[PDB]
Design a protein around this ligand. Structure first.
Ligand SMILES: *Cc1cc2c(cc1C)nc1c(=O)[nH]c(=O)nc-1n2C[C@H](O)[C@H](O)[C@H](O)COP(=O)(O)OP(=O)(O)OC[C@H]1O[C@@H](n2cnc3c(N)ncnc32)[C@H](O)[C@@H]1O
Ligand code: HEM
Ligand SMILES: CCCCCCO[C@@H]1O[C@H](CO)[C@@H](O)[C@H](O)[C@H]1O
Ligand SMILES: O=C([O-])[C@H](O)C=C([O-])O
Ligand code: SF4
Ligand code: F3S
Ligand code: FES
Ligand SMILES: [K+]
Ligand SMILES: [K+]
Lengths: 239, 101, 139, 612
């Protein structure tokens, strides 16, 4: 016996540019497939259509490669359970409002350039002693980084944000802003004032209107929306 | 150099003000509240529609045209409200009258 | 290497002149209550502003003053149920915007960010909006 | 002419952007070299990002320590197949290497004094094995690799290194036995690129995907190892495959050995803490080869858990929930997602799972790739290797947990230091023939248009199931021989491959077929090397040859013993070669290096009986 589940997936081939984006339906026997959506995608590519294209690497939700939109929400295919209701067809699309390179693969180069622009690395006023001894950090100051350093840069949150959809050329987005915050509150970093000064323009930080799609969709359970609110408070009170 | 955070702070301060004017309109109807509302409603509204323009209008020319028209609308709006407060019954009383229907 | 600014310029130059489609968004994204309440806050804010601007404009352009128009409506002896309904519809967007505006100021102070708190504060705002509007429309 | 070629000139090219590649690439840029880093994945997606337990260094933050005690644990752990000059370099350089990462901002967990927190880990001791459990595994809760890779990536953004992301390296450009660069496919637009350079560093990771069940990423396909094999150079010790004691049952996801370091214990269907019987002293913190074999015997003997009696249990619920949340938050989440287990209430179902490759491209302790001709090691001009793709060999026949992340930053830095002391930036770029790399392009085109009878996924599954059933935890001659013959037939049948995507932009059907050719070259060398090695040492266990065979019988006094000739013992590294057209494997052997870098400061450790 079998339990046939249907998946409708977004297709577009840059080598046949003129054929408009379309949805293709595939039938998969859940009794012969792993429990996650990525398992079904790999089973389709291995047994039904090897032209189906998507990014993946770790299969355990840590690398951030397989982010896409499943059943209307952004998430990691490798940790998203297949819905076993056989009467419903699960729809799969690329991360929203992104240029499609091919099928489920988006161009993330602007997302990565935004990340580089906030200088995500430790800066001290005098770095000449680097490498000589461990810098000290108390348990209490280290605890301030929990909920911030775990980000896997999957872009699920920024691509679920309507402000990022309309102004992603100049709004940095939830993922990048939360990492700016992770460097602002690290006790070993000496450039907090300059990090905040970088956001003094109308777009970088201020296009956020607290919609909160970012925190709802994060596969790691983090809260970029709360981190953005903490930066806005610092921006308002620093000298 | 802190124009953006300053603007964000002013926007919240004015929102707070409007919040207080509502109760004050009910407890102390009169010219002070009437003109205060005229200014706060105009400023809160100006900045608010200003955020809407920033979010949805793109292109150097379209943005300048939009923001110029917004200034005109806010000007006419503050004028009309002040005019209504000077020559007519005023905001508080108008609301009480409308509710007596 | 390339600076972050040069990478962003190359990204736009390359994609705007390419054949790549833009993946769907608003048409396929699943809605939630907080998402719907967020665009409604904007919608009510804009409606309220247009309202104040029209009023202000009517003050400057109408022939008669306010009391005259109030008297004319009263003279029609409209159904009080219809009047009640009209008052509800007028105050509803203002009540909604005010209560949700307060919810926004509390976020600006950094509070109420857990997902469960976001959902609960949202439902509280809908309840307060309905209770306020019902109470005010009856007076 | 069907594929336009783009040429680039650099002082140095690094292939790989995991922990080893990034450290080597910005290490070269910080020394003034105009450097390129070519990687098939965006950097932070590399397998390094999945590492959990930690990185070892004798910082002495929890108790007094000595790097020479770490040196001793590593040599004994390697079952004397490790080269002691490289192990000396890595353990002595460890404290400085971990301090460098913390000063880059890596968010290590902390002690009450504000220093880096270190946990216990398997096979590490104080006082040259005589003094009890060491606590030298530095960590960021149980997400140490994720933090190390993200910290190194952020630091790389401060230099002028040129990154070529989503570029797939196809082959080395060799001329006169010297490497002069690499040729690659740009996945985003289908173009072929030739990176010319005076020095090339291979940091491409392992090949755990040659098996059916592994903790490895889908991208760990031995690509750099296969490039070296295709250039006619030898690979080393590929038969030594590490099975990690605890991959989660079913999915295969890793569950950190840090669980046992923090107090967790393994139990069988009768509730017995069985490691007390197999390793009376070290118990659940014995070396990986010993714990994996013990678990396998428990299951073979009928004490496995679950409806199929095919796995065992890792118990953490006797530990305080605050400790599980502070030290093991990542595996707590993974256990729930993949096995539906709440670790504060029930045990995690686990079993030995392929995890890491001790073998790889042979190098000396400075990171230079070597070959072996007429009994002498000889450096390959302009070629370096570091990380899991290399065999330095600091790990020998069994790697100690938390020694790989250390190997990545110590040897990634060493390749850069060695090039800086050998060359200067801007020297002239070596020339290559106008058609250099054409065979790589011809092979790519052949696969792109393949129209046979066996699709790539069918051949890959065939290879994976053969390795899983013929080269597992316990092996034997007749079973290894049948696996050798089955793999050799699958290799000849690649001539019948069938692909379907005929495009060139993001053709993953084609990229996965190139990866299958790379995996098969790694698989053949692994199983033929295993079949030839008639002894048991570290991770290689033969039921037909149960004893370790050294040049002397070290379980007896050496006085009056007759030393076995090189050809009659097994304490030597396996060197493997493959004729790519036929798939025929040839094996040769080279000596293990027992000398350290300074006998006076760190003495060589002679072979001894190895027990935990
Ligand atoms: C699998 C695993 C391993 C592991 C671990 C947990 C898991 C789930 N936890 C560890 C720990 O806590 N402590 C430790 O000491 N080791 C641990 N390990 C083992 C260790 O993580 C690995 O040995 C190590 O991370 C190796 O990294 P390395 O730098 O050698 O490489 P990689 O991260 O796998 O990255 C490979 C890079 O090479 C590029 N590549 C590969 N092929 C190509 C081609 N053809 N062309 C261009 N680039 C290529 C990849 O893109 C990648 O960047
Ligand atoms: C009468 C009112 C009018 C004419 C009005 C109009 C506006 C407008 C046009 C916006 C912009 C909407 C957007 O950017 O999405 C806005 C936003 C907002 N208003 Fe009002 N508003 C009124 C009263 C109030 C009151 C009583 C409070 C309290 C309040 C709180 C807010 C807040 C907090 C915002 C900013 C929302 C954000 O953070 O994005 N408003 N209002
Ligand atoms: C027209 C009114 C729109 C209301 C849409 C409600 O939408 C529902 O909201 C809840 C709570 O956020 C979510 O958990 C559901 O997944 C979502 O479908
Ligand atoms: O158990 C782990 O965290 C681990 O898998 C570490 C080594 O070193 O490989
Ligand atoms: S905050 Fe969450 S959703 Fe956003 S990039 Fe990081 S892990 Fe992905
Ligand atoms: S969804 Fe967007 S508007 Fe702000 S709260 Fe999250 S970044
Ligand atoms: S494949 Fe790594 S996050 Fe899904
Ligand atoms: K700081
Ligand atoms: K190796």
């Amino acid at each position: 016996t079998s339990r046939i589940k249907k998946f409708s997936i977004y297709r577009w081939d840059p080598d046949k540019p003129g054929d408009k984006p379309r949805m293709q339906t595939y039938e998969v026997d859940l009794n012969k497939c792993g429990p996650m959506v990525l398992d079904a995608l790999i089973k389709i590519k291995n047994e039904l259509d090897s032209t189906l294209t998507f990014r993946r690497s770790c299969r355990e939700g840590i690398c951030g490669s397989c982010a896409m939109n499943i059943a209307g929400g952004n998430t990691l295919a490798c940790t998203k359970k297949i819905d076993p209701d056989l009467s419903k067809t699960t729809k799969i699309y690329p991360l929203p409002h992104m240029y499609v390179v091919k099928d489920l693969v988006p161009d993330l180069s602007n997302f990565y350039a935004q990340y580089k622009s906030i200088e995500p690395y430790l800066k001290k006023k005098d770095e000449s002693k680097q490498g000589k001894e461990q810098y000290l950090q108390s348990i209490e100051d280290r605890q301030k980084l929990d909920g911030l350093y775990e980000c896997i840069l999957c872009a699920c949150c920024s691509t679920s944000c309507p402000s990022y959809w309309w102004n992603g050329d100049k709004y940095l987005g939830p993922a990048v802003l939360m990492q700016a915050y992770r460097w602002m509150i690290d006790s070993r970093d000496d450039y907090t004032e300059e990090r905040l000064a970088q956001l003094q323009d109308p777009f970088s930080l201020y296009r956020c209107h607290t919609i909160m799609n970012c925190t709802r969709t994060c596969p790691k359970g983090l809260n970029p929306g709360k981190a953005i609110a903490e930066i806005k408070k610092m921006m308002a009170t620093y000298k | 150099s802190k124009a953006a955070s300053l603007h964000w702070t002013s926007e919240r301060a004015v929102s707070a003000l409007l919040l207080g004017l509502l109760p004050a309109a009910y407890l102390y109807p009169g010219p002070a509240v009437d003109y205060s509302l005229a200014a706060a409603l105009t400023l809160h509204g100006h900045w608010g529609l200003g955020q809407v323009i920033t979010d949805y209008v793109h292109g150097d020319t379209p943005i300048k045209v939009a923001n110029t028209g917004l200034y005109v609308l806010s000007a006419i709006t503050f004028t009309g409200l002040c005019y209504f407060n000077y020559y007519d019954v005023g905001i508080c009383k108008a609301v009480a009258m409308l509710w007596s229907i | 290497a390339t600076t972050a600014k040069e990478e962003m310029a190359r990204f736009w130059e390359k994609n705007t002149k390419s054949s790549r489609p833009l993946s769907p968004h608003i048409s396929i994204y699943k809605w939630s209550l907080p998402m719907a309440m967020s665009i409604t806050h904007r919608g009510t804010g804009v409606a309220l502003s247009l309202g104040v601007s029209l009023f202000s404009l009517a003050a400057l352009l109408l022939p008669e003053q306010f009391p005259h128009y109030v008297a004319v409506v009263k003279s029609l002896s409209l159904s009080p149920a219809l009047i009640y309904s009209a008052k509800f519809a007028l105050v509803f967007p203002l009540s909604y915007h005010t209560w949700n505006g307060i919810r926004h100021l509390v976020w600006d102070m950094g509070k109420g960010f857990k997902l469960s708190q976001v959902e609960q504060s949202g439902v509280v705002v809908l309840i307060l909006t309905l209770l306020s509007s019902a109470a005010i429309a009856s007076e | 002419t069907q594929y336009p070629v783009v040429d680039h000139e650099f002082d140095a090219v690094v292939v790989g952007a995991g922990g080893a590649g990034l450290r080597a690439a910005f290490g070269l840029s910080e020394a003034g070299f105009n450097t390129a880093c070519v990687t098939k994945l965006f950097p932070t997606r590399s397998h390094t990002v999945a590492a959990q337990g930690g990185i070892n260094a004798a910082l002495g933050n929890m108790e007094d320590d000595n790097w020479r005690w770490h040196f001793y644990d590593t040599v004994k752990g390697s079952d004397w197949l490790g080269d002691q000059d490289a192990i000396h370099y890595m353990t002595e350089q460890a404290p400085a290497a971990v301090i460098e990462l913390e000063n880059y901002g890596m968010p290590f967990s902390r002690t009450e004094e504000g220093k880096i927190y270190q946990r216990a880990f398997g096979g590490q001791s104080l006082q040259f094995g005589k003094g009890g459990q060491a606590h030298r595994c530095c960590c960021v809760a149980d997400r140490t690799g994720h933090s190390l890779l993200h910290t190194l990536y952020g630091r790389s953004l401060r230099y002028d290194t040129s990154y070529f992301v989503e570029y797939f390296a196809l082959d080395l450009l060799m001329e006169n036995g010297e490497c002069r660069g690499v040729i690659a496919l740009c996945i985003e637009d289908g173009t072929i690129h030739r990176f010319r350079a005076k020095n090339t560093v291979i940091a491409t990771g392992g090949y755990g995907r040659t098996y059916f069940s592994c903790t490895s990423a889908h991208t760990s396909t031995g690509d750099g190892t296969a490039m070296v094999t295709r250039a006619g150079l030898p690979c080393q010790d590929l038969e030594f495959v590490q099975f990690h004691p605890t991959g989660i049952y079913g999915a295969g996801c890793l569950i950190t050995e840090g669980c046992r370091g923090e107090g967790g214990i393994l139990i069988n269907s009768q509730g017995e803490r069985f490691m007390e019987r197999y390793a009376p002293v070290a118990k659940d913190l014995a070396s990986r080869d010993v714990v994996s074999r013990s678990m396998t015997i428990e299951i073979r003997e009928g004490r496995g858990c679950g409806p199929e009696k095919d796995h065992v249990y890792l118990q953490l619920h006797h530990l305080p929930p605050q400790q599980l949340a502070t030290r093991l938050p990542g595996i707590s989440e993974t256990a729930m997602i993949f096995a539906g287990v709440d670790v504060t209430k029930e045990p995690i179902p686990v079993l030995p799972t392929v995890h890491y490759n001790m073998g790889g491209i042979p190098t000396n302790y400075k990171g230079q790739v070597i070959t072996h001709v007429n009994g002498e090691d000889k450096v390959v001009p302009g070629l370096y290797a570091c990380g899991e793709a290399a065999s330095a060999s600091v790990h020998g026949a069994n790697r100690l947990g938390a020694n790989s992340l250390l190997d990545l930053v110590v040897f990634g830095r060493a390749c850069a230091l060695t090039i800086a002391e050998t060359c200067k930036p801007g020297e002239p770029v070596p020339s290559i023939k106008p058609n250099a790399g054409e065979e790589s392009v011809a092979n790519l085109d052949k696969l792109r248009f393949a129209d046979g009878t066996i699709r790539t996924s069918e051949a890959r599954l065939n290879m994976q199931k053969t390795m899983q059933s013929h080269a597992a935890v316990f092996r034997t001659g007749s079973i290894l021989q049948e696996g050798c013959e089955k793999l050799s037939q699958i290799y000849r049948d690649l001539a019948h491959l069938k692909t379907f995507d005929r495009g060139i932009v993001w053709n993953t059907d084609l990229v996965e077929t190139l990866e299958l050719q790379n995996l098969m070259l790694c698989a053949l060398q692994t199983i033929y090397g295993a079949e030839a090695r008639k002894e048991s040492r570290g991770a290689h266990a033969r039921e037909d040859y149960k004893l370790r065979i050294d040049e002397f019988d070290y379980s007896k006094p050496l006085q009056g013993q007759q030393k076995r000739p090189f050809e009659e013992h097994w304490r030597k590294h396996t060197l493997s070669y493959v004729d790519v057209k036929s798939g025929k494997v040839t094996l040769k052997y080279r000596p293990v290096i027992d000398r350290t870098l300074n006998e006076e400061d760190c003495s060589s450790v002679p072979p001894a009986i190895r027990s935990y």
